[PDB]
Amino acid sequence: HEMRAAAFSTPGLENLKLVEAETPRPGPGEVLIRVKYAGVNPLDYNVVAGAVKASPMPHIPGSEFAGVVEEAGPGVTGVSRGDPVVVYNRLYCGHCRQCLTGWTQMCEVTGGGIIGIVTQGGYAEYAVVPAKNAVATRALKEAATLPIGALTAWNMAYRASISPGEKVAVVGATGNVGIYAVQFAKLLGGEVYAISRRKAKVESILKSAGADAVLTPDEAKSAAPFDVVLDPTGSASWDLSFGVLGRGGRYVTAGALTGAEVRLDLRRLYGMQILVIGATGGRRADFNTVVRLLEAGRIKAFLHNVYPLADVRKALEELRSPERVGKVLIAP
Amino acid sequence: HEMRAAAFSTPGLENLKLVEAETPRPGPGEVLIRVKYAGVNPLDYNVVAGAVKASPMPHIPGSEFAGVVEEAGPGVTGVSRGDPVVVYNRLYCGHCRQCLTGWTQMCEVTGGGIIGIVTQGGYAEYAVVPAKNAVATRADLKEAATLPIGALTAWNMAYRASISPGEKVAVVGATGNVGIYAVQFAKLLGGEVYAISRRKAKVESILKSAGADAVLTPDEAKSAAPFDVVLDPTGSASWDLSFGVLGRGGRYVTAGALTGAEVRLDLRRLYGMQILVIGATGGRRADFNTVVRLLEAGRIKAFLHNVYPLADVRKALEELRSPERVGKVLIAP
Amino acid sequence: HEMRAAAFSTPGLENLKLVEAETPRPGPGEVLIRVKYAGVNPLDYNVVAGAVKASPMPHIPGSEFAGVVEEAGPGVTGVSRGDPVVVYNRLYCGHCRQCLTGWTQMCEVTGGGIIGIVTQGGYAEYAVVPAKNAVATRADLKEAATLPIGALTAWNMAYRASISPGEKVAVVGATGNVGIYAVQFAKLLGGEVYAISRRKAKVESILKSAGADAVLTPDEAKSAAPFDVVLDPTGSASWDLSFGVLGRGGRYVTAGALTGAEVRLDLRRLYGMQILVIGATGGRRADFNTVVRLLEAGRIKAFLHNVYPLADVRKALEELRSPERVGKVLIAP
Amino acid sequence: HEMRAAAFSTPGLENLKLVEAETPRPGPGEVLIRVKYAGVNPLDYNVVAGAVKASPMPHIPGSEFAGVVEEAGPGVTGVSRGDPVVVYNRLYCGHCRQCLTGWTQMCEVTGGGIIGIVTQGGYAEYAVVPAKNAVATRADLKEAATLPIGALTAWNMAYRASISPGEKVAVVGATGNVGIYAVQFAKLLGGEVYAISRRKAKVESILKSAGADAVLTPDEAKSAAPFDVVLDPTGSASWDLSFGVLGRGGRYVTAGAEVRLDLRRLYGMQILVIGATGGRRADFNTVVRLLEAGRIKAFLHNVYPLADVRKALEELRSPERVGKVLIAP
Numbered sequence A: 001h002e003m004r005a006a007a008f009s010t011p012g013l014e015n016l017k018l019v020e021a022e023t024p025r026p027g028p029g030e031v032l033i034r035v036k037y038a039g040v041n042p043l044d045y046n047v048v049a050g051a052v053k054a055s056p057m058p059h060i061p062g063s064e065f066a067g068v069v070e071e072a073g074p075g076v077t078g079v080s081r082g083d084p085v086v087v088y089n090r091l092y093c094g095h096c097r098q099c100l101t102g103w104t105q106m107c108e109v110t111g112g113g114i115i116g117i118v119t120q121g122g123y124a125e126y127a128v129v130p131a132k133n134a135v136a137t138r139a140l141k142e143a144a145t146l147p148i149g150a151l152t153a154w155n156m157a158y159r160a161s162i163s164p165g166e167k168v169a170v171v172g173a174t175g176n177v178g179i180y181a182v183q184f185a186k187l188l189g190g191e192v193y194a195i196s197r198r199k200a201k202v203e204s205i206l207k208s209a210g211a212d213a214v215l216t217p218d219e220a221k222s223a224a225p226f227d228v229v230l231d232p233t234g235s236a237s238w239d240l241s242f243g244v245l246g247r248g249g250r251y252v253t254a255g256a257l258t259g260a261e262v263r264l265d266l267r268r269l270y271g272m273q274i275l276v277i278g279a280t281g282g283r284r285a286d287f288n289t290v291v292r293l294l295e296a297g298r299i300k301a302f303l304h305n306v307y308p309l310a311d312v313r314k315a316l317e318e319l320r321s322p323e324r325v326g327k328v329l330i331a332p
Numbered sequence B, C: 001h002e003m004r005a006a007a008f009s010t011p012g013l014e015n016l017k018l019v020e021a022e023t024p025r026p027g028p029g030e031v032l033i034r035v036k037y038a039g040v041n042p043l044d045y046n047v048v049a050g051a052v053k054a055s056p057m058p059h060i061p062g063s064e065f066a067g068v069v070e071e072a073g074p075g076v077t078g079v080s081r082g083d084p085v086v087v088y089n090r091l092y093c094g095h096c097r098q099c100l101t102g103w104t105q106m107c108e109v110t111g112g113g114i115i116g117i118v119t120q121g122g123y124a125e126y127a128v129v130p131a132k133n134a135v136a137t138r139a140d141l142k143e144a145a146t147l148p149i150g151a152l153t154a155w156n157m158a159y160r161a162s163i164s165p166g167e168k169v170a171v172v173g174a175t176g177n178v179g180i181y182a183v184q185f186a187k188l189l190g191g192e193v194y195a196i197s198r199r200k201a202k203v204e205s206i207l208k209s210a211g212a213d214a215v216l217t218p219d220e221a222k223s224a225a226p227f228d229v230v231l232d233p234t235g236s237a238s239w240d241l242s243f244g245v246l247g248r249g250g251r252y253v254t255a256g257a258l259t260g261a262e263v264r265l266d267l268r269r270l271y272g273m274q275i276l277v278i279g280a281t282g283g284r285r286a287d288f289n290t291v292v293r294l295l296e297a298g299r300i301k302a303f304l305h306n307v308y309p310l311a312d313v314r315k316a317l318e319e320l321r322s323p324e325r326v327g328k329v330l331i332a333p
Numbered sequence D: 001h002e003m004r005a006a007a008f009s010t011p012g013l014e015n016l017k018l019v020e021a022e023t024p025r026p027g028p029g030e031v032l033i034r035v036k037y038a039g040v041n042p043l044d045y046n047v048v049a050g051a052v053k054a055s056p057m058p059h060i061p062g063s064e065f066a067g068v069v070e071e072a073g074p075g076v077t078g079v080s081r082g083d084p085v086v087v088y089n090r091l092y093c094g095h096c097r098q099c100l101t102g103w104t105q106m107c108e109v110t111g112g113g114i115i116g117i118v119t120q121g122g123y124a125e126y127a128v129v130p131a132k133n134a135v136a137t138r139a140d141l142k143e144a145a146t147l148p149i150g151a152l153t154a155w156n157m158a159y160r161a162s163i164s165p166g167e168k169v170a171v172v173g174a175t176g177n178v179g180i181y182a183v184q185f186a187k188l189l190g191g192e193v194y195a196i197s198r199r200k201a202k203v204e205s206i207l208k209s210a211g212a213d214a215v216l217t218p219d220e221a222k223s224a225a226p227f228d229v230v231l232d233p234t235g236s237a238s239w240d241l242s243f244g245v246l247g248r249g250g251r252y253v254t255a256g257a258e259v260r261l262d263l264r265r266l267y268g269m270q271i272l273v274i275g276a277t278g279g280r281r282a283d284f285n286t287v288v289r290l291l292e293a294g295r296i297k298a299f300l301h302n303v304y305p306l307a308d309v310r311k312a313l314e315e316l317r318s319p320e321r322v323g324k325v326l327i328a329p
């Protein structure tokens, strides 16, 4: 059996090519999934561009996908052929200190290894994952926005300890993570201030996602202080995100694995009793929660475009586009 | 120098009389409030029935009220005459361990003393309260008058339940004043909210409009179990059903109105399921400010039923006992 | 091929039953719509109850709905599969004296015929309507489904009342589906808007957020008289309390839901005060587009009470008469 | 007794002198008002500049004012000493075809004569006006003094424009005294209001707080077209808007000022070009009530004492003025 796939033998977007590949077969504890939709994320871009080493080489990227189970590996029970599933993207052992306390994305054994980075991912017709990573859902186009976009945002909001009344600023609120951070900050009862430079073009979308106000970076300085800043853009908005925080403010940062180094004002940190909280991925337990919330309609998938596998390079480049407002998906 | 008020020299609903009393005067750290609206709650009823002892005697009840500052006593800054305010109803010292950790309703010096139970209350044209308890508000005062007991109690129950988004929250007594706010807060916190009511045939849609995702009779609630959280402001009435529907790690939060009750608690089920049985009363002084701002922002909603003049206080207490419809009963002096 | 639908073969609320029925197919100039939301209105109640004759029989009611275009029939253009639409509910020919002057609800060829009364309606998964009656909208379809009766009727009443800024406009039945939008349009045209309601405490906040400057009981409205305009969407229910509040040159704009509505008019008061009694029904096809555009812009608001599934259609229709109800009841097939 | 007043004997701001004058006495049908606030408008500037003849001479200008009734003339009833009032500025006879149909500003007997132009006006401690022109008000007289010209002229333009909810209304010169109320009335009537300004950054927030849905420069407005209504308080829209910005059935209303007009475009688009001036006496009562109810708002820039009347008038032309200038005698 042969399948279509987007693969690169050397990093660089220019080397990402449509190829024909041996359709993998699921081993013990694994399932084979017919990928229906895969997300296009800064992480996928950075994998292809070479900012993070991938395996195997040549490499099929794509760390966020949903599809239908094609074959269950020997001794696999719990999910079976025909089941629509969405895939939690971290490999985890289930027996180390981190997995047993819920932080599967910190697994000491797998290093937090990401499907589509340390294994072949979803920019292909078929992919093999662990069966325990595959979550049956009745939601697949919307579900394919969950493994990175929604789950990362949930994990940030969870780690910020937002409480009703608290002023929450979301930097990068039009990005895949930020759009779900707006939603989760509102669902936890926050007063939600969404920040984008394109406020005029995007204000309707962001309020639809739960924002109480949309602000440019310079206006947010005037709306300070905030009790929480959710900043999924890494080091990119560090200067603005730290200075708008009030007493006891929580700055939650996540990122897409690219170089990020900043200058921390210790005097302000200790004087204001601010917390700078790292977040990455999400817990395996909370992925089930995010899937159920999508099924219940309590969170929403904001889609910009769906592209065939053959347009994967243009889809990746559309992450940079000022006209893009929402998620870009690939459909093998 | 004189004011109208409702008062009783001895307990009993029959003994609640419209009188003329000496208009009280604010001392230092106090304000005098022209009462615009006072809530009618189970607590007030039980004070007038004698189920809870009041002081002084004879007694003006009314522990939930809003109005306009008429006079500021010595040393008072930050409120002036004309200010519409809604009154936090727990006296608190600010210096004990409970106050200093924010549990001002547990003050060790005042014993949690409730305005209108250990002081004269708001069933009167005027009342005196500490200035630090009077919160300035731009909300309509009829709606503000639902906050000191109804909303704040419900908030404090929901806060003590550590509700996480997605968790299933059942609210028992969801048509009552506390319960209808418990539905709103459970939803505001991301819960999936199931309002339980024997009257679902009549109250289903009003409870949906308060934020419930579904409304269930008790028999349907058994089939919808398990729940992660049960909020029960009605004390001992619903105990076996509220406790039986809880899942692993479930939290049962109970509040009451100082009527005595006892339940039979199966500790084996409690420890086998790692359930928590959590008492809640009143709310935190800091959280009352938050509740006031949430009303002003329209993030929660005051469900009102009828306003009665002071002279119909007996009719008003009766309407609490057998309501024509769901919502808060107010007294307007 | 088969769809679920609420239908009745003889009138009476007890005979409205969930059935399976042939999915209808769109003939020329017609579209098939997957109904997302249908309004529950007094008009739908009166059709099911027998006050109005429906065709065909057995009959699927529901004159107010929005949804997603599923199939376009022969000859249809500019309306494609998946387009969310809300349905103008009057059948019109486009060529008679009434249609050509804009009064499409007065069409002389179709007789003003209302979709879901003279055709099968929206209390089903699918309904076929004329393509030109389907208005594309980017509004949430839950909100859009409050427009074809509630907002459009209200708009048409306010428009025919010649309201000018400053004028005192009383809206009776102000919490009904039409009334709540009539508050909004009277205010949008510049009126000083008095919402008249006897349950004033319960509905004041919602009516003020719809744009009422004040909320008065009917007896307070007698004391606040004179008014320049009464918007009255309740048939004959309010006439005997409200007609007397109009001053000189006042306009009494009457609409209703097709039940008997005979009243006694004092011709002497009418001619002595130069009052106009102005009939209003439905609205103009052109104005429906405007009302849809105003909802998309946020200039008018849909005030929802609850959404029921199609199986609960009898409960939804009876909730229309509930003392508990404030706001729109929707059916979601 | 004597009063302070600004008067001129020959035209020109530099000839507007502070003098002492006999306080006038109210005759039949008149009241004496102690002026509290008087507006500064282009009309007062042009009267003082000599562009409009005035009487009597020497002349006290000031056509927009509010104050307190000090004395009622013989036989006057209805309004009483001590009443705060704001003055409708058109003399009207009450008996001709215009007055009887409500167009008092068109009165055929008085010629539309304006108080402070054909009578001594409000830039003085006291002024005499007809009793029927004084409207009692519970509004702050500071804000009331913005109504007889600013608010009323704008109301009359929006009235004559037949604005329907949803119509797109462009207001030219939107920071002017009339323009800023025109923004408000266009919004109060349901319009979608585009305020046009060359000073867009300086005034955007002020125009939004007056009810403008957008603030545009003249070149940005070319793209927002077409408009159903163009309100042009000063007759200057031809410098900021091509006649082509008006849509089908479009209405252009001007309350001030020769221009060149494509008749073919006018009849082909069924456009209306509509003149407006002052306001109807009945509508003045309505404007006063809307201010009292907070439904329209007075945007003030500065208040000057009567001694600074020359600076107040000249401030009408300052590029730094955003809002109304008042004199307080």
Ligand SMILES: [Cl-]
Binding pocket: A041, A042, A174, A175, A176, A177, A319
């Ligand atoms: Cl992104």
Ligand SMILES: [Cl-]
Binding pocket: C041, C042, C175, C176, C177, C178
């Ligand atoms: Cl209704």
Ligand SMILES: [Cl-]
Binding pocket: D041, D042, D175, D176, D177, D178
């Ligand atoms: Cl000006």
Ligand SMILES: [Zn+2]
Binding pocket: A092, A093, A094, A095, A096, A097, A098, A099, A100, A106, A107, A108, A109, A110
């Ligand atoms: Zn592990």
Ligand SMILES: [Zn+2]
Binding pocket: B092, B093, B094, B095, B096, B097, B098, B099, B100, B106, B107, B108, B109, B110
């Ligand atoms: Zn204490």
Ligand SMILES: [Zn+2]
Binding pocket: C092, C093, C094, C095, C096, C097, C098, C099, C106, C107, C108, C109, C110
């Ligand atoms: Zn016709």
Ligand SMILES: [Zn+2]
Binding pocket: D092, D093, D094, D095, D096, D097, D098, D099, D100, D106, D107, D108, D109, D110
């Ligand atoms: Zn005349």
